[PDB]
Amino acid sequence: DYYEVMGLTRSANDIDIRRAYRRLALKYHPDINKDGAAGDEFLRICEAYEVLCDPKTKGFYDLY
């Protein structure tokens, strides 16, 4: 899901999403995290934050 990948829950706030993306995308960035199982993880982190940082897309996803 777009939520579990960030680690948050379904009732996360806006600051909650900011903090979750902050830590998860400073832990998995290619220039910082050299290698591992961090190829798909960073891409889904970016996609989840992009979906969940805009209220219209966020709500449209939440209903479906």
């Binding site: 199982a37 798909d40 993880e41 889904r44």
Partner: protein
């Protein structure tokens, strides 16, 4: 995390398993048996020929 899920997503969203499961569930709902497990045994037995 992404690796454990991806290994299962790639398996489960591949055609053989998915369009086996969908037809099995469809026929299970159509038949409405008392005990589903032996009915699925039967259905898989006479579907193994195909």
């Amino acid at each position: 995390q992404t690796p454990l899920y991806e290994k299962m997503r790639d398996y489960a969203h591949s055609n053989k398993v998915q369009e086996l499961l969908q037809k099995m569930t469809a026929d299970l709902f159509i038949e409405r048996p008392a005990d589903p497990v032996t009915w699925m045994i039967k259905w898989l037995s006479e579907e193994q020929k195909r």
